[PDB]
Scaffold this active site. Structure first.
Site, PDB file in Angstrom:
ATOM      1  N   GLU B  49       0.879  -1.163   0.000  1.00  0.00           N
ATOM      2  CA  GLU B  49       0.000   0.000   0.000  1.00  0.00           C
ATOM      3  C   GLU B  49       0.923   1.220   0.000  1.00  0.00           C
ATOM      4  O   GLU B  49       1.795   1.342   0.860  1.00  0.00           O
ATOM      5  CB  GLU B  49      -0.936   0.000   1.213  1.00  0.00           C
ATOM      6  CG  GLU B  49      -2.048   1.031   1.040  1.00  0.00           C
ATOM      7  CD  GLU B  49      -2.852   1.244   2.306  1.00  0.00           C
ATOM      8  OE1 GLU B  49      -2.255   1.264   3.405  1.00  0.00           O
ATOM      9  OE2 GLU B  49      -4.093   1.430   2.184  1.00  0.00           O
ATOM     10  N   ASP B  60      -4.508  10.470   8.405  1.00  0.00           N
ATOM     11  CA  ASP B  60      -3.249   9.895   8.851  1.00  0.00           C
ATOM     12  C   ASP B  60      -2.785  10.400  10.212  1.00  0.00           C
ATOM     13  O   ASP B  60      -2.971  11.583  10.533  1.00  0.00           O
ATOM     14  CB  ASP B  60      -2.162  10.137   7.807  1.00  0.00           C
ATOM     15  CG  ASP B  60      -2.464   9.406   6.480  1.00  0.00           C
ATOM     16  OD1 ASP B  60      -2.472   8.142   6.456  1.00  0.00           O
ATOM     17  OD2 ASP B  60      -2.740  10.082   5.470  1.00  0.00           O
ATOM     18  N   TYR B 175     -10.891  -3.551   3.381  1.00  0.00           N
ATOM     19  CA  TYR B 175      -9.992  -3.025   4.417  1.00  0.00           C
ATOM     20  C   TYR B 175     -10.734  -3.031   5.764  1.00  0.00           C
ATOM     21  O   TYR B 175     -11.619  -2.204   6.002  1.00  0.00           O
ATOM     22  CB  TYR B 175      -9.526  -1.598   4.045  1.00  0.00           C
ATOM     23  CG  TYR B 175      -8.333  -1.124   4.837  1.00  0.00           C
ATOM     24  CD1 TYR B 175      -8.350  -1.108   6.254  1.00  0.00           C
ATOM     25  CD2 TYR B 175      -7.158  -0.714   4.192  1.00  0.00           C
ATOM     26  CE1 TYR B 175      -7.242  -0.695   6.958  1.00  0.00           C
ATOM     27  CE2 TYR B 175      -6.067  -0.272   4.903  1.00  0.00           C
ATOM     28  CZ  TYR B 175      -6.114  -0.300   6.305  1.00  0.00           C
ATOM     29  OH  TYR B 175      -5.050   0.117   7.024  1.00  0.00           O
TER      30      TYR B 175
HETATM   31  O1  LIG Z   1      -3.538   1.761   5.587  1.00  0.00           O
HETATM   32  C1  LIG Z   1      -3.507   2.805   6.233  1.00  0.00           C
HETATM   33  N1  LIG Z   1      -2.552   3.037   7.146  1.00  0.00           N
HETATM   34  C2  LIG Z   1      -1.537   2.020   7.424  1.00  0.00           C
HETATM   35  C3  LIG Z   1      -2.021   0.991   8.452  1.00  0.00           C
HETATM   36  O2  LIG Z   1      -2.252   1.641   9.732  1.00  0.00           O
HETATM   37  P1  LIG Z   1      -1.046   1.845  10.796  1.00  0.00           P
HETATM   38  O3  LIG Z   1      -0.192   0.621  10.716  1.00  0.00           O
HETATM   39  O4  LIG Z   1      -1.765   2.047  12.097  1.00  0.00           O
HETATM   40  O5  LIG Z   1      -0.235   3.023  10.252  1.00  0.00           O
HETATM   41  C4  LIG Z   1      -4.606   3.781   6.007  1.00  0.00           C
HETATM   42  C5  LIG Z   1      -5.750   3.380   5.352  1.00  0.00           C
HETATM   43  C6  LIG Z   1      -6.778   4.308   5.174  1.00  0.00           C
HETATM   44  C7  LIG Z   1      -6.660   5.599   5.759  1.00  0.00           C
HETATM   45  O6  LIG Z   1      -7.617   6.552   5.624  1.00  0.00           O
HETATM   46  C8  LIG Z   1      -8.978   6.213   5.823  1.00  0.00           C
HETATM   47  F1  LIG Z   1      -9.096   5.411   6.870  1.00  0.00           F
HETATM   48  F2  LIG Z   1      -9.691   7.305   6.005  1.00  0.00           F
HETATM   49  F3  LIG Z   1      -9.397   5.603   4.725  1.00  0.00           F
HETATM   50  C9  LIG Z   1      -5.520   5.976   6.427  1.00  0.00           C
HETATM   51  C10 LIG Z   1      -4.503   5.063   6.581  1.00  0.00           C
HETATM   52  O1  LIG Z   2      -6.578   5.949   9.663  1.00  0.00           O
HETATM   53  C1  LIG Z   2      -6.540   6.625  10.685  1.00  0.00           C
HETATM   54  N1  LIG Z   2      -5.481   6.592  11.484  1.00  0.00           N
HETATM   55  C2  LIG Z   2      -4.576   5.460  11.666  1.00  0.00           C
HETATM   56  C3  LIG Z   2      -4.068   4.828  10.376  1.00  0.00           C
HETATM   57  O2  LIG Z   2      -3.536   5.849   9.508  1.00  0.00           O
HETATM   58  P1  LIG Z   2      -1.955   6.074   9.483  1.00  0.00           P
HETATM   59  O3  LIG Z   2      -1.539   6.383  10.905  1.00  0.00           O
HETATM   60  O4  LIG Z   2      -1.711   7.209   8.515  1.00  0.00           O
HETATM   61  O5  LIG Z   2      -1.430   4.767   8.983  1.00  0.00           O
HETATM   62  C4  LIG Z   2      -7.698   7.578  10.883  1.00  0.00           C
HETATM   63  C5  LIG Z   2      -7.919   8.425  11.977  1.00  0.00           C
HETATM   64  C6  LIG Z   2      -9.042   9.275  11.954  1.00  0.00           C
HETATM   65  C7  LIG Z   2      -9.884   9.247  10.824  1.00  0.00           C
HETATM   66  O6  LIG Z   2     -10.985  10.006  10.703  1.00  0.00           O
HETATM   67  C8  LIG Z   2     -10.891  11.359  10.265  1.00  0.00           C
HETATM   68  F1  LIG Z   2      -9.942  11.555   9.396  1.00  0.00           F
HETATM   69  F2  LIG Z   2     -12.048  11.669   9.777  1.00  0.00           F
HETATM   70  F3  LIG Z   2     -10.633  12.127  11.246  1.00  0.00           F
HETATM   71  C9  LIG Z   2      -9.651   8.412   9.758  1.00  0.00           C
HETATM   72  C10 LIG Z   2      -8.550   7.598   9.792  1.00  0.00           C
END
Ligand SMILES: O=C(NCCOP(=O)(O)O)c1ccc(OC(F)(F)F)cc1
Ligand SMILES: O=C(NCCOP(=O)(O)O)c1ccc(OC(F)(F)F)cc1
Ligand SMILES: O=C(NCCOP(=O)(O)O)c1ccc(OC(F)(F)F)cc1
Ligand SMILES: O=C(NCCOP(=O)(O)O)c1ccc(OC(F)(F)F)cc1
Ligand SMILES: O=C(NCCOP(=O)(O)O)c1ccc(OC(F)(F)F)cc1
Ligand SMILES: O=C(NCCOP(=O)(O)O)c1ccc(OC(F)(F)F)cc1
Ligand SMILES: *Cc1c(COP(=O)(O)O)cnc(C)c1O
Ligand SMILES: *Cc1c(COP(=O)(O)O)cnc(C)c1O
Ligand code: NA
Ligand code: NA
EC number: 4.2.1.20
Lengths: 396, 268, 396, 268
Positions: B49, B60, B175
């Protein structure tokens, strides 16, 4: 599935991560319900009257218009508690929070104005308020930060991204995505994902309703045009809404032209940006050619939301409302004019609306026209900005 | 193409989960990012990804926000990310590659043209972070017209209507979010993951990859044991980049060890 | 010879040099005439409504009074245009100037508040305004000086004597003695020589008239007491006047206690000074043992007039009104309380009135009492003062 | 006593006007002020007008305001002024001495006690700057009970009612203001001085001394020619003090020359 249309033609929608959709659906249902509830309406009316000072005056400006055929009135939102129109809708949104069983408020702020509004509403209604503010804005806006803290709000400096309004919006949404069972996100303009553009319009619409009644009483007819500045769109849609069906009434929205449209240093996305999808909505925005979101520039920080409410984009597209811009210097001259000729110090935001009405008048001084400017706020907050600019060019 | 379908079939035949790293394209620079990605593959990644740096990455967390900033500091643009994607596919013909996009970057020069560029460079799927299923029609249509799988987040508190939409509309993989909140109190609405996994299978959904907060081998095995087809890890991998910025060689060694351990956890 | 009594019992009079008596007699006749003229009343009502924002709200404060038997309302003069009650009477006095054929206004100001009020009224009514301000006050009050200048007023720094409020009063009177054919002296409180204490009361009395109507509508009875701060006496007599004949209604005036009465660093001449003759009147004042006029000290510069209106001295002497003091720290705590519990930032002046009501409540929390505080102004102007004090003692 | 009456009789017998200097007591210090006053007398002053330093001298212009400040800088109090008055009278038994007072200093420790102290030290008159005729009753009563003449300002625009009050209530001399305003426009209401002089005589008023802006010998002769009994000069005398602060001996020489010239202008 929603109860109401999330779009205004092609503009608007709900472009948020899936996890936030239940927060928006909950809010939409609470709003739909509130709008049918005489008890909610009575509570909101009571706060607006006995706390905020509604109705606000409608002031004629004969000193400004002498020798012309313009009659100019100002809708005095500068006289609302808090010194700007923002107070109307934060009071309604605080009541919606209570309706949903929430005891906490989250809000974003750029230079502090919506943060103060959110903080005062939360203090009155006994809600625990936390406000996200870009660290660059915290540094520069000591008076607003101090007001917020005096009112018992937690001010959280945002160091992420570019530490400004956008990053503050982003942190507020992140927080809400996790906390929405107990916290309401009190968004600061008529923009963002549905249902916010609808809610904020309906909680600002008393501006145009009162204007209509006051102009009918004083002049016996509707205005030829109502004029309002557009940062995000809330004061303007508040003034416009009740006149939308009065097709003779001009609706003119004024975006900040900054140093001039041709410099690129402006905040006029509705007429000079390009439609994008961000802040939960499809709307014109300030953005690079490859679609990175940029900033708006204005002498008035309150006008720096780098997009615009989707209802304004729609009303423009159908030709119902017209949008123009006013530069920093035009707004400064309007500020000075109102101070000197009416003894009212206008917010630099509102000064953009007044500058456009002055132009309508001066360009065509024999045109018969009855104009209302929404004087969205007072300008005590702007006297240091105005002082510095005038001193810097030796104007004072 | 059929890269996800072929991957999951192959993994099924081996009684094996998928391990899918997430990184931001061009973090900490284009050259080093290409190297990072080759190392993730050589260490055992089953799919990738990949994020395109975006001014306002709302969805994020801090680690990936930091990665985003590093890529902008390096001047990384979406056009450069697509050049990188074509090179990555040209080295690795079968690995499924999924993008994590923000809606403005897809919409910017036309939704259809975006997906056609994804097809040209050999991308397999696109997850648009800020497009909920309710708003997804033009995105999923354009994706499928260009042989790209549209990926949707299934929250663990998803209601049955949402489960059925995600099952109907998604392709490649579903997902499956690990948590609907960070605190035990915020995560109260979350249903058991094995139950959602079972419902998704009942509704003939694309195979589930569990993601968000997966940072250790035991969570990879737990995902597989709950019935998911695999697990996604972003923050844990990107942390290794951030902690070793000053030593690019050590960074790659640590990436290799981490991915090898996580992949090992997925094998029968 | 005068048309009206210049005294309130032994207090008041017209202790000015002979050359000024025709200016006072002219003003008294114009006032007497204006008060009988329905056209003057209609013009004044029109400015108060459509320009200043009258009537002002009456806000209940249930968050503050929870758990007690006090019901507390605030009369929201902080919501008047200009952010304080001073606006009411400068509008009336500007109309009196026009009535007498005058095109110019002279005013005194201490820290700038009355100067801004005079300047805004003069701008609206097209009068040429000149304001005397002690050079020490000019240095320290950049925001007020700038407001005055933006409004087209001439600000004249006073270097004579000790370059403060007294010297500003003195220069304004000197100017008027020569220019009164064309200039009106717009005195800033209900004090000075007759007819000013009478005029300023009558042009502030809508405060108590509205309060009476609002409390009758909301509670069905009169207040047990109305409470107002006393610098010079105008906001307090404005609140008190309509209740003077309602002998059940307490009238409580709050003078600034400064660092504490026993330190001598205070501004409570009515209860802790000694009757003298200065500022054109016989009244309590701050003065040395051998009769040199001194200064008042308060955290709130607005309360620093070193005497008090002669009607307050009279109402005190007969026992109709009661006067108390509140120290700097008491006022600071009331400021903080209103900010945090009602989302209203009160002027430090008004905070002295609120502090006394808080004391009435807290000392006797089971006493049934219906109280009105005159919230004479907003406190945005005070946030730097409050910040510095709280920081200096490590309270923040 | 009868010092004004005896002075004006003596001057009448000599066909001569009075010349009356004004100074502030204790300007620039007590010692120098006593010397100044003796010099004014030795140079020909017929009477004195003397101010007691007051925190807020509303009715005084810049020169006398400056004198007031100098006396406060020297720590001069009203009690010290009364000590000075007694010494001055003890040196000069017949010269009329008039005080220029502010109402607070008279009222402070009791109106009657003030006038009794004036009598004890041998003062002849008191002009209370901020007490108009309309408010004067307790002041004039206390003054006359203690053998002090109460002095009133007669403005040149005075109406007939005011003329009659000033004529009835004043004693010693009537203080006739030169001008009701500084500008020719501000002074439009002012009637001819000879006409007011004639009206005051018709109403049997105390003899008129003209004051305000008298700075040159020709104005002293003009006052006498208009029918006034004399002229008062303050600012012009005090200016000499201010211009010679650094040279006390030169100050006295210049005071002597100035007063001698002004007095010369009053003689037949
Ligand atoms: O795959 C993502 N992050 C990597 C896996 O999470 P982590 O290992 O906690 O970083 C990931 C997937 C979708 C996302 O945005 C939303 F949820 F809104 F679609 C943000 C991050
Ligand atoms: O995906 C989220 N965070 C963890 C995984 O992402 P990342 O840490 O980038 O891998 C994550 C956190 C909040 C969220 O909602 C909003 F954006 F609306 F606030 C959507 C996705
Ligand atoms: O314009 C906005 N806020 C105004 C804040 O006002 P101020 O304090 O005056 O900058 C604003 C905030 C959030 C938003 O949408 C979303 F939530 F999605 F980000 C859209 C507009
Ligand atoms: O208190 C007075 N002014 C208030 C000015 O208000 P601010 O600007 O807030 O200090 C004030 C001014 C003049 C006065 O009498 C007289 F004219 F005779 F001197 C009595 C009181
Ligand atoms: O007497 C005046 N000035 C000239 C003579 O005094 P001084 O210059 O001290 O000798 C003088 C000026 C103004 C005045 O009216 C008021 F005080 F009310 F403003 C009264 C007296
Ligand atoms: O005698 C006075 N000054 C000296 C003569 O005037 P000038 O020579 O112009 O200083 C003098 C007399 C009265 C006065 O106050 C008021 F007019 F109000 F009574 C002020 C100054
Ligand atoms: C916040 C603010 C605005 C701009 O916001 P809109 O939502 O566009 O109305 C304009 N005027 C004033 C005084 C404001 O405080
Ligand atoms: C000027 C001022 C006062 C004090 O003046 P008063 O004449 O005693 O009323 C009090 N409160 C506020 C807000 C003021 O501006
Ligand atoms: Na905008
Ligand atoms: Na006082």
């Amino acid at each position: 599935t929603t109860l109401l249309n999330p779009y205004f033609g092609e503009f608007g929608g709900m472009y948020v991560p899936q996890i936030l959709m239940p927060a928006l659906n909950q809010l939409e249902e609470a709003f739909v319900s509130a709008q049918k509830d005489p008890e909610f309406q009575a509570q909101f009316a009571d706060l607006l009257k006995n706390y905020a000072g509604r109705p606000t005056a409608l002031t004629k400006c004969q000193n400004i218009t002498a020798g012309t055929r313009t009659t100019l009135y100002l809708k005095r939102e500068d006289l609302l508690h808090g010194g700007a129109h923002k107070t109307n809708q934060v009071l309604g949104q605080a009541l919606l929070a209570k309706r949903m069983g929430k005891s906490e408020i989250i809000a974003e702020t750029g230079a502090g104005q919506h943060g103060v509004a959110s903080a005062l509403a939360s203090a009155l209604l006994g809600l625990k308020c936390r406000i996200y503010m870009g660290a660059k804005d915290v540094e520069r806006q000591s008076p607003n930060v101090f007001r917020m803290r005096l009112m018992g709000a937690e001010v959280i400096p945002v160091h992420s991204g570019s530490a400004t309004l956008k990053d503050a919006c982003n942190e507020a949404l992140r927080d809400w995505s996790g906390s929405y069972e107990t916290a309401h996100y009190m968004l600061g303009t008529a923009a963002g994902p549905h249902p916010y553009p609808t809610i904020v319009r309906e909680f600002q619409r008393m501006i145009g309703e009162e204007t209509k009644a006051q102009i009918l009483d004083k002049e016996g007819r509707l205005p030829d045009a109502v004029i309002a500045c557009v940062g995000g769109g809330s004061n303007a849609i508040g003034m416009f809404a009740d006149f939308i069906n009065d097709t003779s009434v001009g609706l003119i929205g004024v975006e900040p032209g900054g140093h001039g449209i041709e410099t690129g240093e402006h905040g006029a996305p509705l007429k000079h940006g390009r439609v994008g999808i961000y802040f939960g909505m499809k709307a014109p925005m300030m953005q690079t050619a490859d679609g990175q979101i940029e900033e708006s520039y204005s002498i008035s920080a309150g006008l720096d939301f780098p997009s615009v409410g989707p209802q304004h984009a729609y009303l423009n597209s159908i030709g119902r409302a017209d949008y123009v811009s006013i530069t920093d210097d035009e707004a400064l001259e309007a500020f000075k004019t109102l101070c000197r000729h009416e003894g009212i110090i206008p917010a630099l935001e509102s000064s953009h609306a007044l500058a456009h009405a002055l132009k309508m008048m001066r360009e065509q001084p024999e045109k018969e026209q009855l104009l209302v400017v929404n004087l969205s706020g007072r300008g005590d907050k702007d006297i240091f900005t105005v002082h510095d600019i005038l001193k810097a060019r030796g104007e004072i | 193409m059929e890269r996800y379908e072929n991957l999951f079939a192959q993994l099924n035949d081996r009684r094996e989960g998928a391990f899918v790293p997430f990184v931001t394209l061009g973090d900490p620079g284009i050259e080093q990012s290409l190297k990072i990605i080759d190392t993730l593959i050589d260490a055992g990644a089953d799919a990738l990804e990949l994020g395109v740096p975006f001014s306002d990455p709302l969805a994020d967390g801090p680690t990936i926000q930091n990665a985003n900033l590093r890529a902008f500091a390096a001047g990384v643009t979406p056009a450069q990310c697509f050049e990188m994607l074509a090179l990555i596919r040209e080295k690795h013909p079968t690995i499924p590659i999924g993008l994590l996009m923000y809606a403005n970057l897809v919409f910017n020069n036309g939704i259809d043209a975006f997906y056609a560029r994804c097809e040209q460079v050999g991308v397999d799927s696109v997850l648009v972070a800020d497009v909920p299923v309710e708003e997804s029609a033009p995105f999923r249509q354009a994706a499928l017209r260009h042989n790209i799988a549209p990926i949707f987040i299934c929250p663990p508190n998803a209601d049955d209507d949402l489960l059925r939409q995600v099952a109907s509309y998604g392709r490649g993989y579903t997902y499956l979010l690990s948590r609907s909140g960070v605190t035990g109190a915020e995560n109260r609405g979350a249903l058991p993951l094995h139950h959602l996994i079972e419902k998704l299978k009942e509704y003939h959904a694309a195979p589930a990859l569990q993601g968000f907060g997966i940072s250790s081998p035991e969570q990879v095995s737990a995902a597989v044991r709950a019935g998911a087809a695999g697990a996604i890890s972003g923050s844990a991998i990107v942390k290794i980049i951030e902690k070793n910025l000053a030593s690019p060689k050590q960074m790659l060694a640590e990436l290799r060890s981490f991915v090898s351990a996580m992949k090992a956890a997925s094998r029968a």
